[PDB]
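Dear colleagues,

For the upcoming journal club I promised to circulate an example of a predicted protein-ligand complex. I picked one with chlorophyll A because it came up in last month's discussion. The inputs are reproduced below in full, followed by the predicted structure.
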Amino acid sequence: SDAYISDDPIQPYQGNPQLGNLATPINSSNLAKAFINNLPAYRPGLTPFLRGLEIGMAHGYFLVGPEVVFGPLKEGSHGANLSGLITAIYITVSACLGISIFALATFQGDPRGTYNSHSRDRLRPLRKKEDWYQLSGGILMGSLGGAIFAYALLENFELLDSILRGAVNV
Amino acid sequence: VVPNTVTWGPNVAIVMIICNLIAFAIGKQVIQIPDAGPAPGTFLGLGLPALLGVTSLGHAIGVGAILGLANIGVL
Amino acid sequence: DATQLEGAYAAAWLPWIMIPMITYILPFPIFAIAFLWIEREG
Amino acid sequence: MALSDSQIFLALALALIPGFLALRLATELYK
Amino acid sequence: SHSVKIYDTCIGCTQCVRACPTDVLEMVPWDGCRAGQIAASPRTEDCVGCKRCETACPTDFLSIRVYLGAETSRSMGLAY
Amino acid sequence: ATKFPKFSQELQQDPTTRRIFYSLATAHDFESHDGMTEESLYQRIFASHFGHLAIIFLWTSGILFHVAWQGNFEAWIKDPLNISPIAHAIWDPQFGPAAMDAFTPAGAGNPVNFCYSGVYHWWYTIGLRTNGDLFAGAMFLLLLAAVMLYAGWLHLQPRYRPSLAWFKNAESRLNHHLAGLFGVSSLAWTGHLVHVAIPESRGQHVGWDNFLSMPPHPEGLKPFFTGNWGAYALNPDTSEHLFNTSQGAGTAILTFLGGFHPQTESLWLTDMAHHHLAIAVIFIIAGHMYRTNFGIGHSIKEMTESLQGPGWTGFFIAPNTGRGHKGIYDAYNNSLHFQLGWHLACLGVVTSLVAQHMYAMPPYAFIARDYTTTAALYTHHQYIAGFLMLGAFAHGGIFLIRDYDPVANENNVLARVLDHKEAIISHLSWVSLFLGFHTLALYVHNDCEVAFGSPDKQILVEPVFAQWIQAVHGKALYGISSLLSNPDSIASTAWPNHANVWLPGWLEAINNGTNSLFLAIGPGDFLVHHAIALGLHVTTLILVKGALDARGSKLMPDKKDFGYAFPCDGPGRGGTCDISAWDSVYLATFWMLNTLGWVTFYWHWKHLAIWSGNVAQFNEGSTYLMGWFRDYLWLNSAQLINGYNPYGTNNLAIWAWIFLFGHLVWAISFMFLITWRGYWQELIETLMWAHENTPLSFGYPKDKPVALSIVQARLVGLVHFTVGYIATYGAFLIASTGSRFP
Ligand code: F6C
Ligand code: CLA
Ligand code: CLA
Ligand code: CLA
Ligand code: CLA
Ligand SMILES: CCCCCCCCCCCCCCCC(=O)OC[C@H](COP(=O)(O)OC[C@@H](O)CO)OC(=O)CCCCCCCCCCCCCCC
Ligand SMILES: CC1=C(/C=C/C(C)=C/C=C/C(C)=C/C=C/C=C(C)/C=C/C=C(C)/C=C/C2=C(C)CCCC2(C)C)C(C)(C)CCC1
Ligand code: SF4
Ligand code: SF4
Ligand SMILES: [Ca+2]
């Protein structure tokens, strides 16, 4: 009687009510889609290396901080920044080893699940193993670089502080 | 310490009546009015249930308004 | 006396980060977003 | 007396309501 | 593209057609004036908007009007 | 085809860089937008108004927040004559320590900006005493801006978009704006003035914690209900009352003293509360004139359509006006450009009134002694008013282009002024020519007399009519015993009534030769008033000519078919440059800027000579033009241009930099204003050749580089001329006053 006869804010996913999802404002509004679809994972046209490079830069940058503030070396500035840098380095190398072995194990013949050729998953667009290896290399490069950029900004915090206060104009 | 509160004088009966008439003015816009029971609509539109409800809300509004005006000097 | 920028006001660390964000960190992303908005095709 | 840090952070958090209301009105007026 | 409109005060003097640098205008038979001709503007996608046709018109007011409209790469006169 | 702009398919097909520039300057012209109905137009304008009010509230909230966080409001209320109010803090990382020291005052620990907007005086006159009060007001305005934003978003929803008949309701809106936007709001402001502003002026603190406790008067709403209203005007503030303190205080809340508080040199707060009450009552009355849906009331349309003909039931003060005002109601109500150009003229007259009244009758405590604030506020509102008056005639022209119906307005007043428009334009031309020839020739004669060593041979004409109007108000400065100057005159005594209880207070102020209320005027004032007359007349000539010739002239009969803004009609018929009606608002912006320059130059020099004590500098130096050049521009520049020199920097360094910045922008304007399009298009063609033939230059323009169009560059050069003209004079007026009178 009322089952999809009135027009509500929550629609079937892709107009298909037998799919296992709903079109809610968090996965289907113009603001949510404009943000998510333009994130490097989903931005149209990008090569996998550039996607991974930007993901890594953003990720290695913030991963330095938790150990700088909370780590065992936090009582001293230099050691805290070094502990944060090597924590970001280790998490990056572990995550990229995982990306590489995911691609190695998944793409064997026709893969199973979302990377099978018949899959309709819109949220997982890296369908080839070449995409995954280019992504792994890019995430590694970008994340190690973003980690050492955050490390270099934290090491020179005394200089960056005197600069942003105009103390260098004497 | 306590919110003043006056006794009862012609000034208190005026506020309690002007607030009972505002209740009548706004209680004409209710639904299911003149609901028989007793005197089905023999109170200028309202029945006896609607008159009692309007005057009960008017007494409530009157007690609130009178104690507020007595607290702040006006009454 | 004043060898550097100071704030004698509450949360005086906020100009230190707000002026970079508003003026030379977030503007080129905003310019890129607006450029991609005005150059997108039908 | 002068404002506190919490009074500045209250301002910063409370201006997120006109900040996202303005974005909602801007996208409702359809560029 | 610009809009070039020709009105019935035309006298078929051909001067608008001769003055057009981009060949927008031509003469068509009319029997509405004694020259037997009236201007027409079919290739108005070529119109740049120089209004040489309007300068060449002798009638008061002009029997040909150019209304500058949507700019294309042809009406902007761009060789790049 | 791009997707931008979404409001114009013709600009999406545009393959050049013109569509980006034309999508920015046609974005708010909703009428000429793709698939725009009248109803959708009104609804979009409604939501845009709401977003605009949100911006205004956010701006005021930010001003309040920065005075409460980075100003010295609590430190300034202790001594509002020897402490400079602070706007906000500087966080320029590029300063040297010499500029950090220069912008740091004695009582501050960081570089700051000195506030010249007058908000300290205004907030101090209305009760605000602490930074917590300012922060509470700022947070209220932040939330109120959020409310306006939500209202604007809400009325774009389909169940909430108003109908077109709602927007056309010109009887309900006038009733609710007169009584409820002007009346109830002014009644609430009187309520604040007697509950917060006057008590805090006497020393008692009233807040949102004890205002229900504290009564505004010792007999709380006893005199009002009983009918004895004269009790509220008893025991006012004495002459030796010190503001914000109870020494000399009174108890009256509504009194009509007149003149000024002798210690703040400002209007009395009892007078302003009584004013806003007598305004609120009259406006609440006036918002009961037109009928909405209760039978009683007038109809505006029936009142206007009844002014057709002769007789006492008809339009009798001009019986030869044909159809009179028939169709004038529909011309007003249907055309949004008629309304906007009408309301802009009303607002531009009110803004000039604001400027002309707030220096002569200062309403805020100790703002007459903040000289730079007074000058900045007057110049600010007079330039805003000149722009509003320019846009009034702009939209009067746009109405005659877009919305004017010659058959609905057949032979009425509007179509009757369009008929004889050459008489109006030629008589504005005659007044302009007469004023210009005579004023310039009088000034040049005075120049040649003073240069040849004869200041005594100058033609010095006294403004005897304005000196007499100064006398009819009670000025004894001259030998004219006129109306209120004559103490036992019919006007002074109010013979049957004797109820002008404003007369002694007002004559204590007009005769006081230290305020700005009716300043003394002499021969140098007459000439500059005639220059102001010339300026307003020529600006009106340009705007009236372009509005009345908007629909067509003899050089271009069908000008209404080409729009409001269009470049030209080619080089035929001798040439038709600047022929559109938009080009008249273009050409009159220069004349508005020049006229307001003359106005503000006059005001500033008059007041600088008064404030310095050397009033004879303006008196015997403003009758010839080298005195204006040398004793005003050259002389009051020495502190500004020394804001930074090879020896150091003071706090006038930014005003020197902005002075030069405005000179630069004004000069850049002349590039767009003198050089025209084809030069730059050929230059850009050579640049396109150079770019396609250079190695390693992998970028390529997605949209073809073209020179700015004719109307576009007219607008760009005019915007530059305006911005540089405002920046130069704003930097000079703040620094020539803030240095002489810190
Ligand atoms: C990218 C793209 C591109 C490229 C590539 O790629 C280019 C290049 C060229 C070459 C070839 C040459 C040489 C170089 C030089 O020396 O000089 C410099 C300049 C510049 C500008 C430089 C440039 C560079 C680039 C831009 C880089 C980039 C940067 C970043 C990216 C930014 C950032 C972004 C964000 C987002 C903001 C040129 C030039 C010229 N331009 Mg030209 N470009 C271009 C762009 C542009 C634009 C937009 C405009 C407008 C403004 C123009 C303009 C111009 C003019 C006027 C001229 C001239 O004068 C010149 C010539 O001709 O010679 C002869 N043009 N170039
Ligand atoms: C020369 C005429 C003139 C003068 C003396 C002022 C003076 C003032 N304006 Mg301004 N204003 C003007 C013309 C003028 N205005 C015009 C024509 C416009 C319409 C665009 C504005 C729009 C405007 C806004 C939106 C605001 C002011 C504000 C102010 C006040 C604070 C700024 C200050 O202390 O001094 C400095 C005065 C200068 C002119 C310095 C030069 C800066 C250049 C002009 C920047 C170019 C931008 C543009 C052309 C106009 C900006 C003016 C304003 C930001 C200073 C001050 C009383 C502020 C206020 O209301 O305080 C609460 C404020 O928010 N005005
Ligand atoms: C429109 C009013 C207004 C204006 C002109 C300013 C101006 C300024 N602010 Mg301020 N701000 C405002 C409102 C305003 N503020 C409000 C309401 C708050 C409370 C949340 C703040 C909180 C704030 C902080 C914490 C700081 C500033 C700072 C500054 C200075 C540097 C710029 C900056 O970092 O921005 C920062 C802005 C924010 C953090 C929030 C801004 C929110 C406002 C309401 C946005 C207004 C948008 C406007 C209405 C839309 C106009 C449209 C467009 C055509 C311009 C600058 C003088 C810095 C400073 O003090 O320098 C020393 C500083 O770090 N502001
Ligand atoms: C009492 C009921 C009421 C009230 C308060 C309003 C109020 C308002 N309406 Mg509304 N309206 C109403 C009923 C009402 N309306 C009804 C019944 C209809 C149907 C017919 C409409 C249809 C309508 C439309 C179509 C529109 C409005 C609009 C507006 C706003 C325009 C004025 C403005 O921007 O603010 C400011 C004006 C003042 C504060 C008063 C101005 C008086 C002078 C000029 C200034 C005061 C002088 C004084 C010296 C100031 C000094 C202050 C200084 C010291 C700080 C305003 C907030 C416009 C809008 O949408 O905005 C969102 C608009 O487009 N109304
Ligand atoms: C209530 C005030 C008001 C409103 C709502 C309008 C509304 C409108 N006007 Mg307008 N007008 C006004 C007052 C107003 N006007 C005043 C006061 C003037 C005299 C200055 C004018 C003169 C005028 C003309 C000549 C025209 C309009 C037009 C228009 C329509 C489109 C505007 C547009 O293209 O979008 C948006 C435009 C812009 C966003 C341009 C912004 C750039 C401006 C010019 C300067 C910006 C300042 C600068 C950036 C400061 C930087 C300095 C510093 C950083 C260095 C629109 C309905 C046009 C029209 O109706 O077409 C037929 C039209 O041609 N008006
Ligand atoms: C002020 C503090 C710092 C400022 C940084 C942020 C500035 C604004 C950044 C723009 C991002 C918005 C992108 C919209 C992306 C989007 O949703 O697109 C919506 C709309 C067009 O979208 P479409 O209909 O094409 O959407 C289709 C696709 O999304 C999928 O179907 O674009 C616009 O409305 C442009 C008008 C925005 C005008 C913004 C100005 C309003 C000011 C807002 C203030 C923001 C404050 C936020 C923090 C409190
Ligand atoms: C959601 C969202 C959000 C959030 C955001 C976020 C989350 C953030 C962030 C952020 C981040 C996280 C950022 C970042 C970054 C980065 C960067 C900027 C980087 C870099 C780098 C570099 C530059 C490097 C370099 C190098 C290399 C590579 C090599 C060698 C070494 C070196 C160092 C040189 C919010 C709510 C707020 C709002 C909006 C939306
Ligand atoms: S405007 Fe120029 S190109 Fe167009 S029809 Fe006339 S003469 Fe030909
Ligand atoms: S120039 Fe004018 S009159 Fe002659 S043919 Fe062309 S349109 Fe007709
Ligand atoms: Ca440790």
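Two points we might discuss: The CA atoms of residues 10 and 22 of chain D lie 19 Å apart. Chain D touches chain A at residues 23, 27 (CB under 8 Å).

See you all on Thursday,
B. R.
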